[PDB]
């Protein structure tokens, strides 16, 4: 959020919740994508390596 | 940036025999060879197929052997094009209109397609300029009444 | 382990607590001999005493656990309660030379708002002042201009169970039509003829 990039504190209790939840979904997507990408690469290599 | 060129991808080449010709402009029925596998009998059966091949310059007579390529879409029922002639029928190959190369045929599409977009951008701009002049004329008659009525008040306050 | 919370002025005894949560739970008021038996007895012990059906028992265990956490219902904060009745009054202030902040406070029935200290002048939560002299809030009956009271009414804090209006959506037509046939009989046969 714009208010989060400017270093402003949460407006109220609920704002703190949304900030934490949204951040939990940000780190869950990064690790999810990068985590799943390594699986694919590790899997494709096995097929190609074992097929060659 | 605004023009979408054709794929221009080469495909497989099939050798067939022209069955019919001269019935419709730039089109001949070629008979190619195929094979279908019967899973129950574990036996291959001859599965010949007949397609409508696009003859651009009408340089094919019924009876000659040709080489056709798929993926060239010219009509609803036509998806094949003539690559070249293997063996002529009746007259030599040198006595018929030359078969345009696939590059030449593709260039016609791009040129024709590119020209089409040039017409649209002109029609769109003209239609927009033809509609902005009618919307600016309403402002004229509307702006004069306002200025003619608003200045009347301004003059009665000095 | 089962910590007991001290009674609050608005809820001095058990009969009051069981009366506020309604759901006809005041039948087992005599089961609990003391105030600590309500917060010490367990499920199994509430089943032998006769607290039934299971809906009323689980509902009591919930409000019980909800009382220990200080999640009181309307009127819980009240400190100046008298025999189950409290009085609300408007406390005017001066937030600016042209405004006025009115707060619904709870003071003794006899004393006046301006005759109380900050510690003895509680601000009841959930009650607001609309206009210059109207106290608006659930279960706030007016006594005078700027004075209202909260009588301890059965089902004060209860969570009403949704009741089907007329047989429900599926059966609404049948109950209405079937009841319309029992009305035209009294009008015509029992009374008309």
């Amino acid at each position: 959020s714009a208010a989060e990039l400017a270093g402003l504190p949460p407006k109220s209790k609920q704002e703190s919740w949304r900030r934490k939840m949204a951040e939990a979904r940000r780190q869950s997507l990064e690790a999810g994508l990068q985590g799943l990408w390594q699986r694919k690469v590790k899997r494709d290599q096995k097929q190609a390596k074992e097929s060659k | 940036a605004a023009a979408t060129k054709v794929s221009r991808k080469m495909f497989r080449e099939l050798h067939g025999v022209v069955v019919t010709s001269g019935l419709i402009d730039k089109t001949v029925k070629v008979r190619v060879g195929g094979q279908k596998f019967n899973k129950f009998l574990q036996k291959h059966f001859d599965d010949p197929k007949q397609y409508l091949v696009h003859d651009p310059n009408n340089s094919l007579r019924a009876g000659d052997v040709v080489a056709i390529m798929p993926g060239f879409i010219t009509s609803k029922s036509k998806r094949h094009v003539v690559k070249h002639i293997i063996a002529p029928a009746g007259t030599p190959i040198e006595e018929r209109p030359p078969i345009p190369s696939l590059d030449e045929l593709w260039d016609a599409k791009d040129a024709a397609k590119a020209a089409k977009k040039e017409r649209k951008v002109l029609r769109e701009k003209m239609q927009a300029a033809e509609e902005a002049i009618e919307l600016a004329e309403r402002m004229a008659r509307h702006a004069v009444r306002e200025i003619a009525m608003r200045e009347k008040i301004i003059s009665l306050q000095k | 382990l089962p910590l007991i919370p001290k009674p609050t002025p608005f809820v001095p005894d058990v009969p009051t607590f069981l009366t506020l949560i309604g759901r006809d739970l005041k039948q087992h008021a005599d089961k609990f001999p003391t105030w600590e038996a309500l917060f010490t007895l367990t499920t199994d012990q509430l089943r032998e005493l006769g607290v039934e059906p299971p809906r009323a028992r689980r509902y009591l265990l919930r409000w019980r656990q909800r009382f220990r956490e200080g999640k009181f219902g309307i009127g819980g904060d009240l400190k100046h309660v008298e025999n189950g009745v409290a009085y609300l009054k408007i406390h005017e202030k001066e937030a600016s030379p042209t405004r006025t902040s009115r707060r619904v406070v709870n003071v003794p029935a006899n004393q006046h708002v301006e005759e109380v200290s900050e510690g003895e002048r509680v601000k009841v939560k959930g009650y607001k002042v609309k206009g210059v002299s109207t106290i608006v809030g659930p279960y706030a009956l007016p006594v005078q201009k700027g004075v209202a009271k909260l009588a301890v009414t059965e089902g004060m804090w209860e969570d009403k169970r949704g009741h089907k209006v007329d047989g429900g959506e599926r059966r609404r037509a049948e109950v209405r039509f079937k009841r319309g046939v029992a009305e035209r009989k009294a009008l015509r046969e029992k009374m008309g003829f």
Binding site: - | - | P97, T98, T100, K130, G131, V132, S133, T134
Partner: protein
Amino acid sequence: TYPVVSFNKTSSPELKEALETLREKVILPTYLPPELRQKIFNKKYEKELAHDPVTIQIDGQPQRFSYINMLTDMPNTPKNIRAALLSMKNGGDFANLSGLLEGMHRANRKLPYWLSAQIVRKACKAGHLQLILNMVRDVKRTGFTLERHETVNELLFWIQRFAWKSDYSEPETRKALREVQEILDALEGDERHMSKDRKRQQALTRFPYHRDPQFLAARLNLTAELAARRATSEQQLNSANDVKNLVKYAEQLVRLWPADKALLDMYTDEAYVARVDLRYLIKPQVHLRYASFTLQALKNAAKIVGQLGHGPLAAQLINRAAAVEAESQLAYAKVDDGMAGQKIYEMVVGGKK
């Protein structure tokens, strides 16, 4: 909800004609549903209406509605109201305003901003202050909003005069002091009295109507006329209680009212410019009207507050009085002989009657 508007008490024949015209063509149609009301004002249904006129059950016998030419048949609402208003010389003649203004509220008739100020004057100069206060309290039906700064200034003026009439007698003053508080609470709490026009008038004065020095001086006038009489335990408790309000309001008005600022300088210079808000004060005839009681208030309050041992308040109140008295005297030398302004001030401040 409410009973249908009706006028059944008319002393003169002209009054009835003016009301019956407005009633049967501007007020009665408002009781119709939306669909049937879009037919009376159409020509395509003129022939059909003649055969089957619309009906509405109004206190028994249904009514009848035929074609009404919107441009010609419709009457001028402002004119008729004026005619009907001028021809009112009886208690029952003014009892129709509650119904009249109620009908115009149903018809969404934007009435003149100054109309509310006029009805208060004519109705109060005949002895019917209650009829006006009853409509102000019943603002949900009549639509007698206290939008204009003048209307509230005209209402409080008569309220004081009715108490000042009988030499500020305790029975009426006690009742009169309740009417002012009834209004100050309405302007503040009630929302029906708030409109765009009032927001513009508050932004020009920088004082809300409930905290306006001009209106707060009326409550300090009656409060000062109560402590004077007494300053029997039950009555002695009231006196001591009225001295607290006096010192409280006396200290609340001095804060708002700046130092040495009269009526024509209290508000911003941009308030007196526009004629739709706070321009009546400019005329000398109207300034002395609302400057008589407010002036005597400070003089009468400075005295009592001085007997109790309040130096600061005494000088403060006298400061405003000195600045208002000077401005008042100025307008007294310009008001034409015979105007109500010169008379009222002469009878109140001059103590001549």
